[PDB]
Design a protein around this ligand. Structure first.
Ligand SMILES: *C[C@@H]1C(=O)O[C@@H]2/C=C(\C)[C@@H](OC(C)=O)C/C=C(\COC(C)=O)C[C@@H](OC(=O)/C(C)=C/CO)[C@@H]12
Length: 528
C-alpha cells in the first residue's frame, strides 16, 4: 500500500525471547515460520543505546537484567546468536550493526521474570562463550531445550557434565555422549572431555550448540539411538501419502518417513501404522506420470525411498500405493497359478486353479487338489494327472516329474482325476490301460471327454462295452448306435463287437517304444 514519505528511514527489529526455543525439534534455535517475535519499527540511524533503554522500558526489565545477542547467519548456512558489545558499539547505528539485514532479528536474554532480582552475570567479551544446550532423548526420539550457559573458553568439557545432567533431570555421574550440532546433517561427536572448550569444539563461537544424551544400552532399542542419527533422519525427512489400491477412491494416510530408508524400514513404519506384519503388505512403484499405482515392488528391493519418489515434481503430492496380503509377500511373489480341470466321481468337469510351489513335483499339485475336492465314495483315494490335447489323452504324468518341466496351460488342458478301483494295481501280466477318445466318422474329428480304460486278455469285447457304458451312462439304443475302432497314427480299423477276443498286443506299441503315439480305442458316434 501507500508507503509513508519517511518509511525508507525505518527498519524492522524482531526480538525473540528464549521461551521460543523451548520445544523446537529441528536445527538452530527455532523455525522461522513458527517463531513469534516482538516487532519494533525503529529509525535506521538510531543508536544501540537508545534501542536498549527503549526496549528495557517496553519489556519491563531494567538494563541490568537483559542482554542482546543478534541472530547472525553463518557461512555454513545456519543462523545463531552472536556477541554484541554494549560499551563499544552502543553508539553505532542500528542499521550498521544490522549489516543492512532489513528484518533484523535479535535474541533477548533476560533474567527469569520469576525474579524481579540478581542481574545477568557479567560476561567477558574475550574469555567467555555463551553455549546453547540441547538434550536428546532416544526413547521418545525428541529434542529437549536445556537453555544456555556462560562458560570460560578454558573450561574443560568434563566440567560442563554436571549442569547438563542438572538441566535434564539426570542423576549426577550419569555418563553422557556429547556432540556439536554444527549444521543440518552434521552432528560431530566430542571425543575428549578432558580438554578445553576451544580445543574440543570446531571453531568455538558464541551461539554454538552442544547436544547431549545418556550413554545407555537401552538407547539401542530406539530407531534413532544417537543425536547424530536423529539429525540425519530429520534432514532426510519427507511426508508420503499411502493409499490402498484395492479400496477405490481412497484418500489415504500421511506417513512421515526419511529419504534414506530401505524397503524393510518403510514397510515396518507403514505396517505399524496399519497394525500388521510388514511381510503381509505389497507396495507399488509410482507410474511416474499421473496418479495411480505402478509396477509391483519386489520385497528384496535394494534401493531407497528417494529412488521411489524421484519422479514426483517438486510440488506434486508424494504418494505410494500398497495392498494388504493374505500370505507373506515372499510366498505371494513365488506362488504360480496352475489352472486345470478336476474330473469328479460323477464324470463331470470343473475348472480349478491351484497354487503349488513353482518348483514342486506333480505330487505337490495332486495333493493341492486333493485338499480341495470331495473324492468318490469308497474309491481309491489316489489322484493322477493327465494331459489332454484335442480331446485325446496324450500322457499320464508321474508324480516325480517337476512342475516347471510341464507345458504351460496354453490350449493343452491338464486334468486331475481320481483313479478307479480296478486301475490302482492292474494284473501286469494280462491287464492293460488304454486311452479312449470319442470321434465321429474320421479319427482326427475328436470330441467329448476321453478316459483311461482297463482291458483284459482273453476277454470278449462284450464286457469292455459293458464297463465303458457303466462309466459313460447313456440310453442303450443310443449306445448301441455307435462303433468301436483301434487307432494308430491316423490309421484305424473297427472291432467286430459280435465276437472279438481282447488280444493285448493289438493295443501295444512297438516293443521298446514308449513314445507318445500309442494305439488307442476310439468310440465312433455323433456329437452335439
Ligand atoms: C523450555 C523450558 C521451559 O519449558 O521453560 C524453561 C524456561 C524458560 C522458558 C525460560 O526460563 C526463564 C527465562 O526464566 C528460559 C528458558 C530456559 C531456561 O532454562 C535455563 C535454566 O536456562 C530453558 C528451559 O528451562 C530449562 O532449561 C530447565 C527448566 C532445565 C531443568 O532444570 C525452558
Amino acid at each position: 500500500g501507500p508507503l509513508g514519505s519517511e518509511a525508507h528511514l525505518y527498519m524492522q527489529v524482531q526480538i525473540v525471547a528464549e521461551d521460543q526455543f523451548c520445544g523446537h525439534q529441528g536445527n538452530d534455535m527455532y523455525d522461522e515460520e513458527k517463531v513469534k517475535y516482538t516487532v519494533f519499527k525503529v529509525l535506521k540511524n538510531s543508536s544501540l543505546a537508545e534501542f536498549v533503554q527503549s526496549l528495557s522500558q517496553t519489556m519491563g526489565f531494567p538494563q541490568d537484567q537483559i542482554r542482546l545477542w543478534p541472530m547472525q547467519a553463518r557461512s555454513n548456512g545456519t543462523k545463531r546468536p552472536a556477541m554484541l558489545d554494549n560499551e563499544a558499539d552502543g553508539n553505532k547505528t542500528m542499521i550498521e550493526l544490522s549489516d543492512n539485514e532489513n528484518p533484523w532479528t535479535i535474541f533477548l536474554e533476560t533474567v527469569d521474570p520469576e525474579l524481579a532480582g540478581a542481574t545477568l552475570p557479567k560476561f567477558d567479551k574475550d574469555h567467555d562463550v555463551m553455549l546453547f544446550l540441547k538434550m536428546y532423548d532416544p526413547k521418545t526420539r525428541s529434542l529437549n531445550y536445556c537453555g544456555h550457559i556462560y562458560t570460560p573458553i578454558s573450561c574443560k568439557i568434563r566440567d560442563l557434565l554436571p549442569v547438563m545432567c542438572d538441566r535434564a533431570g539426570f542423576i549426577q555421574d550419569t555418563s553422557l555422549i556429547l556432540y556439536e550440532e554444527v549444521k543440518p546433517n552434521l552432528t560431530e561427536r566430542i571425543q575428549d572431555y578432558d580438554v578445553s572448550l576451544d580445543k574440543a569444539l570446531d571453531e568455538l563461537m558464541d551461539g554454538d550448540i552442544i547436544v547431549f544424551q545418556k550413554d545407555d544400552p537401552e538407547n539401542d532399542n530406539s530407531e534413532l539411538p544417537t543425536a547424530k542419527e536423529y539429525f540425519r533422519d530429520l534432514y532426510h525427512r519427507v511426508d508420503v501419502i499411502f493409499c490402498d489400491k484395492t479400496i477405490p477412491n481412497d484418500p489415504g494416510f500421511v506417513v512421515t518417513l526419511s529419504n534414506r530408508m530401505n524397503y524393510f524400514q518403510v514397510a515396518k513404519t507403514v505396517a505399524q501404522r496399519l497394525n500388521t506384519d510388514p511381510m503381509l503388505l505389497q507396495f507399488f512403484k509410482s507410474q511416474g506420470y499421473r496418479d495411480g499405482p505402478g509396477n509391483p515392488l519386489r520385497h528384496n528391493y535394494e534401493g531407497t525411498l528417494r529412488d521411489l519418489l524421484q519422479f514426483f515434481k517438486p510440488r506434486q503430492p508424494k504418494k505410494l500405493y500398497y495392498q494388504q496380503l493374505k500370505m507373506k509377500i515372499t510366498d505371494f511373489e513365488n506362488r504360480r497359478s496352475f489352472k486345470c480341470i478336476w474330473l469328479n466321481s460323477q464324470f463331470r468337469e470343473e475348472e480349478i486353479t491351484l497354487y503349488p510351489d513353482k518348483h514342486g513335483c506333480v505330487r505337490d499339485l495332486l495333493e493341492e487338489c486333493k485338499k480341495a475336492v470331495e473324492l468318490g465314495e469308497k474309491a481309491s483315494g489316489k489322484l493322477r494327472l493327465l494331459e489332454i490335447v484335442s480331446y485325446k489323452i496324450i500322457g499320464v504324468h508321474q508324480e516325480d516329474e517337476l512342475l516347471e518341466c510341464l507345458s504351460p496351460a496354453t490350449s493343452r488342458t491338464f486334468r486331475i482325476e481320481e483313479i478307479p478301483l480296478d486301475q490302482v494295481d492292474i494284473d501286469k501280466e494280462n491287464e492293460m490301460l488304454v486311452t479312449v477318445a470319442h470321434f465321429h466318422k474320421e479319427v482326427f474329428g475328436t470330441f467329448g471327454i476321453p478316459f483311461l480304460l482297463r482291458i483284459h486278455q482273453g476277454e470278449h469285447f462284450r464286457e469292455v462295452m459293458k464297463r465303458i457304458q457303466s462309466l459313460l451312462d447313456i440310453q442303450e439304443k443310443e449306445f448301441e448306435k455307435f462303433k468301436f475302432a483301434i487307432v494308430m497314427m491316423g490309421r484305424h480299423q473297427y472291432i467286430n463287437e459280435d465276437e472279438y477276443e481282447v488280444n493285448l498286443k493289438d493295443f501295444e506299441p512297438q516293443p521298446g517304444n514308449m513314445s507318445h503315439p500309442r494305439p488307442w480305442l476310439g468310440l465312433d458316434h455323433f456329437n452335439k
